[model samples]
Target: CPQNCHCHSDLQHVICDKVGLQKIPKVSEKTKLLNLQRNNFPVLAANSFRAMPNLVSLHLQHCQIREVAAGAFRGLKQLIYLYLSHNDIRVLRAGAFDDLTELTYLYLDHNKVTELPRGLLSPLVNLFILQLNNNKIRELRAGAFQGAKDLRWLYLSENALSSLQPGALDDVENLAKFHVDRNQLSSYPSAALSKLRVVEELKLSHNPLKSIPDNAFQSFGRYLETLWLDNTNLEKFSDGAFLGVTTLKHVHLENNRLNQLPSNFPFDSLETLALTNNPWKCTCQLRGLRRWLEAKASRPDATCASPAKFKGQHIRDTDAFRSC
Candidate 1:
């Protein structure tokens, strides 16, 4: 029942999607979920699932796959979820995922992979969720996640990374959610994440960073929580940019180019702040943001975008910016 593929004999699930196939058809080694998506398969032919070694979920999405020859998943050692997203794969040929040692969720999103060939992800030693988003990865060279020590969740968003080669994720020892949003990082890698001792949600939003390096996230101080420098071009904030995180709770300086904010700025361990469309220059250097927005209760869509007598006031309804 695997002629053109749809073998679902009470659930072994092998749906050969977009049935306009070019190869890889000869299912049932007790096939365990294989959907060769949008196929016109260009190349992946070295033992291509050699009689499906009880493959556990593999969907080659948009398959016009541009080569994956090195053993091509040789014996699928109990493969665990691998979906080659929107393929046009640039290069990953270094044993090409050798045998996928019980691979745990790897979706190379919108590929054109720039580089990662140092042992090519060291045989996935129990990998956990790695989706290289919109790839064209410019740099991350050093060991490049060697051994992948239980990677938690790493989605390199809109990649074209500027650089990170200082022990790049020092063997990813339990990385917990890291997304380099719209990359091209203009500095702030803190020696390539100083060995991410235990990261927790960090997404450098729309990078082009102009400044924030006061020990830039001092090795993720005690497990940071939610820091997405929104639409950056940040006009300096270094005094202690965030003095080693100290369990930061959500901060996204929206549309930046901030005019002032460093009288030992830590805004009393913020619990969610996002100074929207920043340009807030209500002089007297804004007396610590108008005494922290007069002790906020709700007024943080921040206004007073400039100095001409506080143009369009509301930097907490200016008391002349707390008496110039």
Candidate 2:
């Protein structure tokens, strides 16, 4: 195998990750970690890499893969980790991940996937992490993740998703870290994420969600920690929005359009709070926030944007609010 590669593995693990070859190299049937990273295969055909059934991990990153034909990964049942990121994949056909019941981590980010067909991810029952971020996915149809019960971390940030359909994430509900920021969603995907068990880090920043209704994130119940709602157009955050979310530690509400916030915030475990760069109005309605700032004054202070006298002053250190 050293005739066309550069590595020291001759018995099990093959290493040709940077050979820059135009075709897939043939390896032994007992290969474990086949590092075929830099191969420029345009359209991987059926039964191409299915020759090695004992492959534990296939490093297929930066392969310039444009399309993956059906049965391309037909019979690699022993495969555990598949890395297909950093490619130009636009056409991920159906049956691409069939019969791979043991795949734990699947990396398909940094691609151009426009759509996910029905039952496309129904095979990987043991999949733990699914990286579909930085793609061109327009919609997340139902049954796209029918059998992905063990999925924990799903990364869908920087996509073109306009809105999530009903029952889109119903098949996988045990997510821990779900990131869908930098998309085109106008409203919160409440029903889409209501079944999530204990999501820790939720990134809803960089979207156009104009308002957050009551109990928007209560689906995660008492376990959500980091919530990123910055860089948006949020005009209203309901008084009961963060109703029962108690374990919030890192909350980022900066660079938004929140003119007024609820005085009865629920979280007391806030460690890193970024409340700057928002158009916070200073009035009798903002009196509660002034007091909340007194308690957590050590965090970064916010500036008032209204009532001309307090336009540039920090809301935390204002004595004019003493009259309110």
Candidate 3:
């Protein structure tokens, strides 16, 4: 009965929404839209979608799909969108998606995909959007996305990444929005992100980043608009931390463990800046950040935590404590 009627009937109109399928049923020409979402299916057969040439969208989310066998989609040529999110998929085969040429949007979020499949984007050259968030993906080998020439939006946040060392994002020419927040990055990689010539929004929040390289944001040129480095582990910010990010309009560095904020924090073209949750040391060493906050950035209840003398008092505004 595994191959029973792939079509299910509801009321007058046949609705197969959330059909609890154990294995992927072969799709015929009559099948238009198949919704296999939230099913506990472990894995789809190697050539499961080869029979469904007319499938516009296939939803296979929240499944326990771990391994994708080789040549799994040899005949799925007309798939426009495939949703494989929230699964436990870890590994991917080389020729797994060799036949999906017409696919546009592919969702691989909330899965256990560690590294991207080798040449995985070779078949999906025309893909517009690719979601690879919420996984344990650590390294993205150089040219891993070179085949996806028309890719516009790429999501790569909330993973277990510690270092963005080298050969990470080697050659992505026309990327627009690249999200890389909520990872385990320690320091900013100036070279990795600069390869993408034009990135509109670059997110770098929710990481353990203590320091950013001198020219981290320089590679974005004038096209880099927003840079978010909030909820991080930054304690001290040296001068020229944002040298190359001249066109950056918004900078969010809140909810961090900043002890001494940068004095000459560049704000030439900055419109909005947030510097809250910083343990304002209030010593004469903090004269720089305090002065810059007088102009553009916000002042978030400046308190003290130094010298064992001034621990719990509003530093300068109320005139409770002065420069030491």
Candidate 4:
């Protein structure tokens, strides 16, 4: 044990937690995983943790850490997983994150960051997962993800953000899975997210967005492989909305209030589609929808929702359109 800390498991993992460390511990240089919760550190001064430069992961949970000086982590070149959760960080100064060149998972959740510094993320070129949930953030400013070239899995859950600025994501376009669920907007967060290059799955469910206007997801273009807009209180998709989003192999629009389908739906390439729990009215407007569904065998749930007589009838097997 180094300075009353518990050293175990090949000295690679050490638990210095709750030992009342007033400052950085003088632990051996070979310590890889360090836990320092409940430490009495008000501020992480410059080059403080760099003393244990070989650290691959660091935990500073519940440290009451409020202020971290610039370049405080100057020498943690091999650092990857950094946990700064459960803190009072309102605004992390610019240089505190610059030296985390190879960082993978950065947890800044459960804080009070209302807004992030511009270009502050330009140095994290290899960060993979970034968690910013459980905060008071309203919007992401421009240049926030400036050099976020390889980052993925940005979970913005539990935020009441109205939207993101157009230039919020300046250089970061690579995403594997993304979600903006449980939000407060009535419209898609348009151009701020319209130009993603590699998002295979995009889910924007559980919002108040009532309608998806023309070209709504056109910029997602040919790269979006799957999209889930279920439970979004959605009602309509404009005629031109799917003009450029013709590359989807799986699409989900379940649990909405749609009474009709799109006029220009690219129905030829879809392998999976879900439209259950919607109020699909059996009017002449849905004549094309019936024809499309009738072209295939029984697949998803799309029952008639209006005109009382035809209510609950399968839209694909109905003969009501013959009179209209």
True lDDT of residue 234, candidate 3: 78
Best by lDDT: 2
Total clashing pairs for each candidate: 0, 0, 1, 0
The Cα error of candidate 1 at residue 176, in Å, is 6.3
Q: Candidate 1, after superposition: displacement of residue 184 in Å?
A: 21
CA lDDT of each candidate? 0.82, 0.84, 0.71, 0.80
What are the per-residue Cα lDDT tens digits for candidate 3 across 1-324?
Answer: 123334554311123445666777655564656776666777666777766666667777876777778777676787788888988988775777778788899999999888875587888877989999998988777767867888889998988777764666765667888888998777776667767778878888898878865656666656877878888787767666666555777778788777765555666677776766667676766664444455653444556666466677554453323443
Q: Per-residue lDDT for 284 in model 4?
A: 80
RMSD for each model, in Å, please?
A: 14.6, 1.9, 4.2, 3.1
Stretches of candidate 4 exceeding 4 Å from the true structure? 9-11, 16-24, 37-42, 62-64, 269-272, 284-302, 314-324
Model 4 Cα lDDT, one tens digit per residue, 1-324: 468789886758889888988888877787899999877677888888756777899999888888888887888888988998889888775777868888988998888777777767767888888888777777777777778889877877666778888887646687777766777767887778775667777878888888887877666677778888898899888888777876787888899999887778777677778888999888888887666676666585578888798987888776679976
RMSD, candidate 1, Å: 14.6
TM-score of each: 0.36, 0.93, 0.80, 0.85
Ranking by lDDT: 2, 1, 4, 3
RMSD of 3: 4.2
Global lDDT of model 3? 0.71
What lDDT score goes with residue 259 in model 4? 87
lDDT winner, 1 or 2: 2
User: Which regions in candidate 3 have their CA more than 4 angstroms from the true location?
Assistant: 1-15, 26-30, 259-264, 281-324
- Flag regions of model 2 displaced more than 4 Å: 295-298
Question: Given candidate 4, what's the lDDT at residue 269?
Answer: 74
Q: Identify the runs in model 1 with alpha carbons over 4 angstroms from their true place.
A: 1-21, 25-48, 51-74, 78-83, 87-105, 111-125, 132-149, 156-173, 180-197, 204-228, 232-254, 257-263, 266-277, 282-305, 309-324
